[PDB]
Scaffold this active site. Structure first.
Site, PDB file in Angstrom:
ATOM      1  N   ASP A   1       0.916  -1.012  -0.049  1.00 15.56           N
ATOM      2  CA  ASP A   1       0.135   0.001  -0.085  1.00 15.56           C
ATOM      3  C   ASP A   1       1.209   1.199   0.124  1.00 15.56           C
ATOM      4  O   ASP A   1       2.077   1.049   0.577  1.00 15.56           O
ATOM      5  CB  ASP A   1      -0.934   0.181   1.248  1.00 15.56           C
ATOM      6  CG  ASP A   1      -1.879  -1.168   1.355  1.00 15.56           C
ATOM      7  OD1 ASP A   1      -2.212  -1.283   0.213  1.00 15.56           O
ATOM      8  OD2 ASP A   1      -2.334  -1.656   2.351  1.00 15.56           O
TER       9      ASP A   1
ATOM     10  N   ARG B   1     -17.752  10.997  -2.943  1.00 20.29           N
ATOM     11  CA  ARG B   1     -16.941  10.688  -3.926  1.00 20.29           C
ATOM     12  C   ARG B   1     -17.435  11.147  -5.311  1.00 20.29           C
ATOM     13  O   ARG B   1     -16.945  10.641  -6.360  1.00 20.29           O
ATOM     14  CB  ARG B   1     -16.537   9.257  -3.793  1.00 20.29           C
ATOM     15  CG  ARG B   1     -15.719   8.741  -2.675  1.00 20.29           C
ATOM     16  CD  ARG B   1     -15.319   7.360  -2.477  1.00 20.29           C
ATOM     17  NE  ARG B   1     -15.558   6.520  -3.812  1.00 20.29           N
ATOM     18  CZ  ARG B   1     -15.396   5.338  -4.060  1.00 20.29           C
ATOM     19  NH1 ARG B   1     -15.547   4.739  -3.237  1.00 20.29           N
ATOM     20  NH2 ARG B   1     -15.538   4.659  -5.296  1.00 20.29           N
TER      21      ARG B   1
ATOM     22  N   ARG C   1      -6.132   4.020  -7.455  1.00 17.91           N
ATOM     23  CA  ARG C   1      -7.455   4.005  -7.137  1.00 17.91           C
ATOM     24  C   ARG C   1      -8.102   2.329  -7.236  1.00 17.91           C
ATOM     25  O   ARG C   1      -8.881   2.393  -8.390  1.00 17.91           O
ATOM     26  CB  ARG C   1      -8.053   4.958  -7.838  1.00 17.91           C
ATOM     27  CG  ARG C   1      -7.552   6.194  -8.039  1.00 17.91           C
ATOM     28  CD  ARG C   1      -8.304   7.419  -7.810  1.00 17.91           C
ATOM     29  NE  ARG C   1      -7.604   8.754  -8.119  1.00 17.91           N
ATOM     30  CZ  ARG C   1      -8.189   9.911  -7.906  1.00 17.91           C
ATOM     31  NH1 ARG C   1      -9.368  10.367  -8.146  1.00 17.91           N
ATOM     32  NH2 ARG C   1      -7.356  10.976  -8.214  1.00 17.91           N
TER      33      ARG C   1
ATOM     34  N   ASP D   1      -4.107  -3.696   6.024  1.00 20.85           N
ATOM     35  CA  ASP D   1      -4.205  -2.807   7.364  1.00 20.85           C
ATOM     36  C   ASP D   1      -5.715  -3.212   8.167  1.00 20.85           C
ATOM     37  O   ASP D   1      -5.575  -3.652   9.065  1.00 20.85           O
ATOM     38  CB  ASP D   1      -4.281  -1.675   7.324  1.00 20.85           C
ATOM     39  CG  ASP D   1      -4.979  -0.662   6.138  1.00 20.85           C
ATOM     40  OD1 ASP D   1      -6.027  -1.429   5.612  1.00 20.85           O
ATOM     41  OD2 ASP D   1      -4.630   0.471   6.041  1.00 20.85           O
TER      42      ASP D   1
ATOM     43  N   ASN E   1     -10.736  -5.754   5.542  1.00 16.17           N
ATOM     44  CA  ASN E   1     -11.283  -5.886   4.074  1.00 16.17           C
ATOM     45  C   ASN E   1     -10.045  -6.405   3.279  1.00 16.17           C
ATOM     46  O   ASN E   1     -10.286  -6.720   2.105  1.00 16.17           O
ATOM     47  CB  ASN E   1     -11.704  -4.574   3.419  1.00 16.17           C
ATOM     48  CG  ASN E   1     -10.616  -3.409   4.074  1.00 16.17           C
ATOM     49  OD1 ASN E   1     -10.726  -3.192   5.386  1.00 16.17           O
ATOM     50  ND2 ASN E   1     -10.078  -2.674   3.143  1.00 16.17           N
ATOM     51  N   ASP E   2      -8.853  -6.386   4.263  1.00 17.58           N
ATOM     52  CA  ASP E   2      -7.813  -6.883   3.393  1.00 17.58           C
ATOM     53  C   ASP E   2      -7.550  -8.177   3.724  1.00 17.58           C
ATOM     54  O   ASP E   2      -6.795  -8.913   2.990  1.00 17.58           O
ATOM     55  CB  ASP E   2      -6.461  -5.969   3.771  1.00 17.58           C
ATOM     56  CG  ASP E   2      -6.576  -4.475   3.225  1.00 17.58           C
ATOM     57  OD1 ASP E   2      -6.592  -4.165   2.228  1.00 17.58           O
ATOM     58  OD2 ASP E   2      -6.535  -3.772   4.391  1.00 17.58           O
TER      59      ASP E   2
ATOM     60  N   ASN F   1      22.902 -39.556   7.068  1.00 13.22           N
ATOM     61  CA  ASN F   1      22.150 -40.463   7.332  1.00 13.22           C
ATOM     62  C   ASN F   1      22.083 -41.369   6.061  1.00 13.22           C
ATOM     63  O   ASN F   1      21.719 -42.581   6.090  1.00 13.22           O
ATOM     64  CB  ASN F   1      20.468 -39.901   7.190  1.00 13.22           C
ATOM     65  CG  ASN F   1      19.802 -39.447   8.537  1.00 13.22           C
ATOM     66  OD1 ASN F   1      20.043 -38.330   9.055  1.00 13.22           O
ATOM     67  ND2 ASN F   1      19.478 -40.813   9.364  1.00 13.22           N
TER      68      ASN F   1
ATOM     69  N   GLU G   1      25.063 -43.831   7.169  1.00 14.97           N
ATOM     70  CA  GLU G   1      24.462 -44.823   8.134  1.00 14.97           C
ATOM     71  C   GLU G   1      23.643 -46.024   7.465  1.00 14.97           C
ATOM     72  O   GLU G   1      24.179 -46.754   7.578  1.00 14.97           O
ATOM     73  CB  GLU G   1      23.717 -43.891   8.939  1.00 14.97           C
ATOM     74  CG  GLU G   1      24.329 -43.020   9.948  1.00 14.97           C
ATOM     75  CD  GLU G   1      23.163 -42.324  10.936  1.00 14.97           C
ATOM     76  OE1 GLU G   1      21.863 -42.685  10.944  1.00 14.97           O
ATOM     77  OE2 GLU G   1      23.863 -41.591  11.884  1.00 14.97           O
TER      78      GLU G   1
ATOM     79  N   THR H   1      25.207 -35.653  18.775  1.00 14.63           N
ATOM     80  CA  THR H   1      26.225 -35.788  17.987  1.00 14.63           C
ATOM     81  C   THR H   1      26.414 -34.916  16.822  1.00 14.63           C
ATOM     82  O   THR H   1      27.503 -34.317  16.207  1.00 14.63           O
ATOM     83  CB  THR H   1      27.094 -37.061  17.756  1.00 14.63           C
ATOM     84  OG1 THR H   1      26.771 -37.933  18.983  1.00 14.63           O
ATOM     85  CG2 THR H   1      28.587 -36.963  17.546  1.00 14.63           C
TER      86      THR H   1
HETATM   87  C1  LIG Z   1      18.405 -41.149   3.412  1.00 11.50           C
HETATM   88  C2  LIG Z   1      19.255 -41.647   2.759  1.00 11.50           C
HETATM   89  C3  LIG Z   1      18.559 -43.055   2.181  1.00 11.50           C
HETATM   90  C4  LIG Z   1      19.820 -44.186   1.922  1.00 11.50           C
HETATM   91  C5  LIG Z   1      17.849 -42.885   0.485  1.00 11.50           C
HETATM   92  O1  LIG Z   1      17.337 -43.798   0.229  1.00 11.50           O
HETATM   93  O2  LIG Z   1      17.566 -41.502   0.279  1.00 11.50           O
HETATM   94  C6  LIG Z   1      17.451 -41.167  -1.278  1.00 11.50           C
HETATM   95  C7  LIG Z   1      16.084 -40.614  -1.740  1.00 11.50           C
HETATM   96  C8  LIG Z   1      15.135 -40.464  -0.723  1.00 11.50           C
HETATM   97  C9  LIG Z   1      16.815 -38.996  -1.697  1.00 11.50           C
HETATM   98  C10 LIG Z   1      18.391 -39.134  -1.983  1.00 11.50           C
HETATM   99  C11 LIG Z   1      18.712 -40.546  -1.605  1.00 11.50           C
HETATM  100  O3  LIG Z   1      19.385 -41.162  -2.686  1.00 11.50           O
HETATM  101  C12 LIG Z   1      20.331 -42.171  -2.230  1.00 11.50           C
HETATM  102  O4  LIG Z   1      20.579 -42.562  -1.033  1.00 11.50           O
HETATM  103  C13 LIG Z   1      20.438 -43.155  -3.322  1.00 11.50           C
HETATM  104  C14 LIG Z   1      20.625 -44.583  -2.703  1.00 11.50           C
HETATM  105  C15 LIG Z   1      22.018 -45.147  -2.360  1.00 11.50           C
HETATM  106  C16 LIG Z   1      21.859 -46.634  -2.174  1.00 11.50           C
HETATM  107  C17 LIG Z   1      22.805 -47.127  -0.914  1.00 11.50           C
HETATM  108  C18 LIG Z   1      22.617 -48.665  -0.660  1.00 11.50           C
HETATM  109  C19 LIG Z   1      21.971 -49.192   0.694  1.00 11.50           C
HETATM  110  C20 LIG Z   1      18.983 -37.772  -1.245  1.00 11.50           C
HETATM  111  C21 LIG Z   1      18.881 -37.693   0.230  1.00 11.50           C
HETATM  112  O5  LIG Z   1      20.250 -38.361  -1.839  1.00 11.50           O
HETATM  113  C22 LIG Z   1      21.578 -37.980  -1.502  1.00 11.50           C
HETATM  114  C23 LIG Z   1      22.708 -38.455  -2.202  1.00 11.50           C
HETATM  115  O6  LIG Z   1      21.775 -37.627  -0.215  1.00 11.50           O
HETATM  116  C24 LIG Z   1      19.020 -36.633  -2.047  1.00 11.50           C
HETATM  117  C25 LIG Z   1      17.739 -35.800  -2.246  1.00 11.50           C
HETATM  118  O7  LIG Z   1      17.186 -35.433  -0.964  1.00 11.50           O
HETATM  119  C26 LIG Z   1      17.203 -34.154  -0.828  1.00 11.50           C
HETATM  120  O8  LIG Z   1      16.997 -33.212  -1.554  1.00 11.50           O
HETATM  121  C27 LIG Z   1      16.818 -33.808   0.400  1.00 11.50           C
HETATM  122  C28 LIG Z   1      15.357 -33.455   0.582  1.00 11.50           C
HETATM  123  C29 LIG Z   1      14.842 -32.877   1.899  1.00 11.50           C
HETATM  124  C30 LIG Z   1      16.569 -36.717  -2.984  1.00 11.50           C
HETATM  125  O9  LIG Z   1      16.722 -36.728  -4.360  1.00 11.50           O
HETATM  126  C31 LIG Z   1      16.638 -37.798  -5.312  1.00 11.50           C
HETATM  127  O10 LIG Z   1      17.846 -38.295  -5.624  1.00 11.50           O
HETATM  128  C32 LIG Z   1      15.569 -37.758  -6.237  1.00 11.50           C
HETATM  129  C33 LIG Z   1      14.685 -39.128  -6.450  1.00 11.50           C
HETATM  130  C34 LIG Z   1      13.452 -39.002  -7.417  1.00 11.50           C
HETATM  131  C35 LIG Z   1      16.066 -37.784  -2.458  1.00 11.50           C
HETATM  132  O11 LIG Z   1      15.176 -38.411  -3.305  1.00 11.50           O
HETATM  133  C36 LIG Z   1      14.296 -37.140  -2.993  1.00 11.50           C
HETATM  134  O12 LIG Z   1      13.189 -37.405  -2.373  1.00 11.50           O
HETATM  135  C37 LIG Z   1      15.071 -36.006  -3.229  1.00 11.50           C
HETATM  136  C38 LIG Z   1      15.073 -34.857  -4.097  1.00 11.50           C
HETATM  137  O13 LIG Z   1      14.807 -35.488  -1.488  1.00 11.50           O
END
Ligand SMILES: C/C=C(/C)C(=O)O[C@H]1C(C)=C2[C@H]([C@@H]1OC(=O)CCCCCCC)[C@@](C)(OC(C)=O)C[C@H](OC(=O)CCC)[C@@]1(OC(=O)CCC)[C@H]2OC(=O)[C@@]1(C)O
Ligand SMILES: [K+]
Length: 994
Positions: free
Chosen positions: A351, A489, A678, A703, A706-707, A768, A771, A799
């Site tokens: 505004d 007006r 206007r 404000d 109406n908004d 992750n 892991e 950690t």
């Molecule tokens: C938690 C990790 C595991 C091992 C995993 O399977 O994650 C994979 C997968 C879910 C993601 C992937 C994962 O891909 C991998 O782990 C592939 C499997 C490897 C095999 C290991 C053997 C046990 C994300 C984690 O990958 C990376 C390399 O970390 C990346 C990406 O996610 C991010 O954007 C986080 C979003 C909050 C994703 O990308 C993909 O590659 C696209 C798939 C169509 C992920 O996939 C999507 O959902 C994305 C965009 O989020």
């Protein structure tokens, strides 16, 4: 219920068929109520703590976890008596996570406040009606009022329903529609109908909107509509029908949920496919139960390994932090998730007045005709010093100071300003400043008067208090204000009928002073006052007048102009009907123009640059003003929306021009326009939907109530600190100082927040990944559990939690604002980055698995099962005469796990330094760059040590402290990570486009 504003009093008494003197009949009331419902707003939706809790457990991951929490709970219900008591801690903790997570979400929704609920703050509990069943007035419950029955309202009263006014029982009726229309000053109501059937509320002068307050007077009326049908109810619906998308990051979190779920599943099938040879084993339950227990406890581990249990904890805390950081900068963020969407704003609609400007009006140019001699003509322009509403400044002709009195023309002009004006000045001694009493534009004319006291009436020896209205009240006593024809007006102007008071002034007794839009009033002028004389308004003089009027509104000045005139021979007092806005225009004709006054609404200091910032930030800024587009555009050039010589044909429209366009061009206009003048209420909501059809994240300021509809539909609604409460509860952010520049500041922190937030998310995710790799190899090779669920969660909540949140304090890029707005659909990990984590995880997955195995075989502490199936360890007490001349219990040992868990921990601190920059080497962006990071890395390590030594702990984690040589091994394993990444970064940096 109807369109009563256009209908006449009778027609309305007709429609409902109700007697103005009896009211509705008790029968009519039952009939009417059952047909129009109660006059109240729709009940609140009914949600239970139950639904609310169940919702917490709807997420896919949260479920995956809850499931594992059971496999675990059951598994731990199958341990060997005294061989373990800590058995029930693994499942117990996962629950605490889920229990905690739930408790948050709820204590999250209970404290929430609905914008639609706020509305109910504008519903009076009681109302006054006149019904057939009684002679005198009855005070019933608002909820029971019905369309049709007669109602009377007076001062203090909050309007109950939308009422058509029947007859004003007082001399005048004033209402406070501030909230619903945005007019701070109480307006005047009449009884005569309003022709137009599609009129906007502001012009419905015979209408009482529910929720607004009656400032002055008492009146009677017939209820047009009630409930959800009233003006406010129509808003409640637009808001209730409005559905809001999830933060792109919230989307990504659902996206990641679905996916993780798939992968995990495929891993299972793979793992099974791996141990397929088991279909070629001797048929006899040789640990038929000891093998299933095994997989199930790998299942639960696999789960806590794939889900980042501390990420939402980290995000929420990074958001809360930056939030306070903004509060400092007058930007009050109501919803944390938004600090992100804010960062992606691509269009900001503000505004003008309160936010782009100061709204501290002041007149700095006047002009009265000096001479008309046929075609020849000369004006008398002036300038007035001072921007404040303070009676201090001077008047100049060609920058040369002047005593105003010497010009007859000015003596007249001046009065008109004090007489017509309803506003005034006050001086509050506490703050020691002059304050605007009425309306900004009138209260200005007030100080103009003061600064030019035509009669020199000495006031210097006065206190500031009395000094405030000195010169006005002087003129106030000269003439006597008989009555005023308020603003409308249609005619765009207001006037006042005046008497001379004390005799000797009798001649030229009654006068009529007018002030309004120039083109408006000037087309009603047949004369012009040149000094004390008068002359027939001629074409030449008129062109010259309208010419200067344009340089003032269109030129670099960007001034709002007010024409001041006078009706010398005003119609006889009794020949005027003082209660029909429609006829006032006819009473304000045959005028003699006296002079125009140009005032200014200075833009705020920090606005000019803020607008420039957005340019660099690739953010389009769209103004929403009340000015005409002529000056609107001027103001847009003055601050930077437009260049001084930039073309603006299809980039600035008016509420009408826009409406006159077909849905197509209408849409097309929105992706280019920037100055919208206007503009009616509906508009703000259309402009948003269009900006959305262009996949843009827009911000909208508002404000009043109406908004709210608009605010609730804009990706980010910005409410004014000074604005209504409903407006605030409907917006994502509030501006204490109402200053637009605060918006830009807010947006910048959003880009800063998402940048750091971006990294720690990539960080916690990769860990992750690694892991999981570990767990996958652990089972793909049939080795002993290298890492345990209990441990993993610690690493994931604590950690890694510390390093993670610290990464949220990464020094912001210097060029954050020189880059366009982020794309919401931008994935967090893809392409080359996907591969690095694909490789990093692949690494830690090896480092963790191997670190443990290396203790079994190859270590001095551990029994070298070297190059011999450590793998078939499950079949051991039986097969010992074969390849097992040792104790089948080493495998349960803590050293091994305590090894991997240590390599994991150190590799995650190393990977936390690698996360300081997506592609910049540490040798370039050293770790010491972010102190918080290093600090937490210490807190983390010591925490790791804590769970290794402090007696109670080691036992539950299945961890035994390792000596000075085993530790060194941890290092020889982890550290290489930094190098692996430097290399992978160098690649991005050098070859791959980057
Ligand atoms: C938690 C990790 C595991 C091992 C995993 O399977 O994650 C994979 C997968 C879910 C993601 C992937 C994962 O891909 C991998 O782990 C592939 C499997 C490897 C095999 C290991 C053997 C046990 C994300 C984690 O990958 C990376 C390399 O970390 C990346 C990406 O996610 C991010 O954007 C986080 C979003 C909050 C994703 O990308 C993909 O590659 C696209 C798939 C169509 C992920 O996939 C999507 O959902 C994305 C965009 O989020
Ligand atoms: K919204």
């Amino acid at each position: 219920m109807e369109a009563a504003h256009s209908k006449s009093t009778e027609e309305c008494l007709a429609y409902f068929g109700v007697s103005e003197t009896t009211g509705l009949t008790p029968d009519q009331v039952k009939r009417h109520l059952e047909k129009y419902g109660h006059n109240e707003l729709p009940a609140e939706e009914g949600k239970s703590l139950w639904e609310l809790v169940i919702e917490q457990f709807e997420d896919l991951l949260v479920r995956i976890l809850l499931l594992a929490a059971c496999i675990s709970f059951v598994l731990a219900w199958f341990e060997e008596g005294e061989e373990t008591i800590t058995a029930f801690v693994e499942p117990f903790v996962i629950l605490l996570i889920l229990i905690a997570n739930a408790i948050v979400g709820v204590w999250q929704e209970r404290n929430a406040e609905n914008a639609i609920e706020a509305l109910k703050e504008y519903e009076p509990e009681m109302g006054k009606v006149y019904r057939a069943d009684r002679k005198s007035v009855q005070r019933i419950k608002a909820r029971d009022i019905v369309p049709g029955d007669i109602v009377e309202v007076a001062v203090g009263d909050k309007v109950p329903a939308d009422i058509r006014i029947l007859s004003i029982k007082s001399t005048t009726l004033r209402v406070d529609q501030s909230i619903l229309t945005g007019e701070s000053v109480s307006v005047i109501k009449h009884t005569e109908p309003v022709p137009d059937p599609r009129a906007v509320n502001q012009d419905k002068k015979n209408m009482l909107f529910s929720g607004t307050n009656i400032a002055a007077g008492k009146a009677l009326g017939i209820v047009a509509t009630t409930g959800v049908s009233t003006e406010i109810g129509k808003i409640r619906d637009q808001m209730a029908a409005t559905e809001q998308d999830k933060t792109p990051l919230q989307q990504k979190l659902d996206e990641f949920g679905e996916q993780l779920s798939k992968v995990i599943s495929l891993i299972c099938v793979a793992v099974w496919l791996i141990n397929i040879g088991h279909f070629n084993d001797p048929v006899h339950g040789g640990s038929w139960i000891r093998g299933a227990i095994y997989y199930f406890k790998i299942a639960v581990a696999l789960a806590v390994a794939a889900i980042p249990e501390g990420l939402p904890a980290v995000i929420t805390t990074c958001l809360a932090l930056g939030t306070r950081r903004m509060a400092k900068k007058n930007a009050i963020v109501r919803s944390l998730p938004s600090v992100e969407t804010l960062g992606c704003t691509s269009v900001i609609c503000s505004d003008k007045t309160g936010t782009l400007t100061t709204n501290q009006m002041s007149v700095c140019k006047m002009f009265i005709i000096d001479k008309v001699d046929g075609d020849f003509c000369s004006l008398n322009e002036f300038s007035i010093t001072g921007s404040t509403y303070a009676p201090e400044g001077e008047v100049l002709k060609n920058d040369k100071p002047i005593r105003s009195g010497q010009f007859d023309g000015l003596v007249e002009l001046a009065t008109i300003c004090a007489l017509c004006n309803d506003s005034s000045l006050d001086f509050n001694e506490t703050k020691g400043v002059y304050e605007k009493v009425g309306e900004a534009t009138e209260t200005a004319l007030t100080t103009l008067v003061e600064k030019m006291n035509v009669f020199n009436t000495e006031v210097r020896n006065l206190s500031k208090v009395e000094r405030a209205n000195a010169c006005n009240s002087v003129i106030r006593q000269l003439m006597k204000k008989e009555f005023t024809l308020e603003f409308s007006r249609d005619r765009k102007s207001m006037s006042v009928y005046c008497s001379p008071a004390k005799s000797s002034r009798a001649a030229v007794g009654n006068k009529m002073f007018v002030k309004g839009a120039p083109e408006g009033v000037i087309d009603r002028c047949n004369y012009v006052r040149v000094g004390t004389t008068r002359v027939p308004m001629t074409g030449p003089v008129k062109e010259k007048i309208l010419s200067v009027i344009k340089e003032w509104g269109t030129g670099r000045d960007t001034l709002r102009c007010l024409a001041l005139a006078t009706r010398d021979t005003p119609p006889k007092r009794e020949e005027m009907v003082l209660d029909d806005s429609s006829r006032f225009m006819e009473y304000e004709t045959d005028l003699t123009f006296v002079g125009v006054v140009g005032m200014l609404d200075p833009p705020r200091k920090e606005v000019m640059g803020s607008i420039q910032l957005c340019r660099d930030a690739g953010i389009r800024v769209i103004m929403i003003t009340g000015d005409n587009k002529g000056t609107a555009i001027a103001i847009c050039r003055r601050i930077g929306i437009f260049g001084e010589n930039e073309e603006v044909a299809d980039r600035a429209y008016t509420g009408r021009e826009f409406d006159d366009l077909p849905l197509a061009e209408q849409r097309e206009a929105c992706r280019r326009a920037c100055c919208f003048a206007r503009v009616e209420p509906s508009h703000k909501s259309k402009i948003v939907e269009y900006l959305q059809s262009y996949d843009e994240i827009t911000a909208m300021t508002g404000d009043g109530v109406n908004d709210a509809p608009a605010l609730k539909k804009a990706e980010i609604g910005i409410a004014m600190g000074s604005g209504t409460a409903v407006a605030k509860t409907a917006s994502e952010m509030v501006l204490a100082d109402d200053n637009f520049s605060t918006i830009v500041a807010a947006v910048e922190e959003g880009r800063a927040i998402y940048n750091n937030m971006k990294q720690f998310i990539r960080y916690l995710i990769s860990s992750n990944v690694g892991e999981v790799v570990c767990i996958f190899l652990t089972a793909a090779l049939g080795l002993p559990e290298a890492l345990i669920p209990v441990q993993l969660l610690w690493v994931n909540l604590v950690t890694d939690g510390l390093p993670a949140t610290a990464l949220g304090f990464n020094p912001p890029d210097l060029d954050i604002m020189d880059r366009p707005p982020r794309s919401p659909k931008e994935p967090l990990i893809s392409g080359w980055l996907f591969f690095r984590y694909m490789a990093i995880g692949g690494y830690v997955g090896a480092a963790t698995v191997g670190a443990a195995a290396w203790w079994f075989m190859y270590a001095e502490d551990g029994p070298g099962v070297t190059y011999h199936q450590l793998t078939h360890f499950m079949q051991c007490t039986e097969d010992h005469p074969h390849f097992e001349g040792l104790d089948c219990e080493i495998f349960e040992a803590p050293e091994p796990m305590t090894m991997a868990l240590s390599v994991l921990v150190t590799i995650e601190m190393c990977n936390a330094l690698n996360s300081l920059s997506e592609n910049q080497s540490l040798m370039r962006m050293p770790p010491w760059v972010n102190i918080w990071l290093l600090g937490s890395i210490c807190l983390s390590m010591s925490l790791h040590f804590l769970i290794l030594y402090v007696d109670p702990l080691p036992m539950i984690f299945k961890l035994k402290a390792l000596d000075l040589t085993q530790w060194l091994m941890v290092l020889k394993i982890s550290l290489p990570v930094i190098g692996l990444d430097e290399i992978l970064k160098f690649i991005a940096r050098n070859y791959l486009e980057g």
